[PDB]
Amino acid sequence: MQIFVKTLTGKTITLEVEPSDTIENVKAKIQDKEGIPPDQQRLIFAGKQLEDGRTLSDYNIQKESTLHLVLRLRGGMQIFVKTLTGKTITLEVEPSDTIENVKAKIQDKEGIPPDQQRLIFAGKQLEDGRTLSDYNIQKESTLHLVLRL
């Protein structure tokens, strides 16, 4: 099926897709066609930011559906949140951001409830009320992300 991805300037990317294709697959196509890194890409449909792990069918995206592409600026501090599946999530953050706030971003991006998230850094399970600075988390530091068992 054919779908359209539009920037908020009206710049359009037309994609050949399958209902079982994932949002991550779509970002890969956008990178190959437009040269936009997947990390900068934010896809929106029906007012929701679309999670990489989900399929187009999961979001009820169908023939001739129009998705919105919002792009994230780099700017200052980035950190990596890394799964043991080998997925590396880039987050734009600030030193005074709390772990609670980071998990809220992960919930938005990946659909994981904050209470199910375990972030690990320096061998420690990170607590929600502390800042990145409190934990000495620096530019391009990596946090391990695993689920509660």
Added chain:
Amino acid sequence: MQIFVKTLTGKTITLEVEPSDTIENVKAKIQDKEGIPPDQQRLIFAGKQLEDGRTLSDYNIQKESTLHLVLRLRGGMQIFVKTLTGKTITLEVEPSDTIENVKAKIQDKEGIPPDQQRLIFAGKQLEDGRTLSDYNIQKESTLHLVLRL
């Protein structure tokens, strides 16, 4: 004097301006050329989101400087911070951001050290560690900034 406004797809818009032109006036020009409503526009320069009620000269924007045009956001909410002169600081923020983080953002936008900042909302001094939601701070709430030597 001309300036550039660039989207993250690389589309560049060239504007005629004077140094006393306001950010609001720049957004209006962007709407005239691109059709993007000012409220969805976010202009980034020197690592800061630019305030509508300020001039180009206020930000040391010079001939053929480039501004980043980030579109809509998506995301959370705007709050206002009133200075002693009645001057408004507009911040993009999330419910789980802490007061400590709000002070950090004020530093980023105004160059005021966090240790010299006190924030007040509904007649109370706000603790650094608590979140905006914890203080019942919602969309377009106005905070008061009080500074100390």
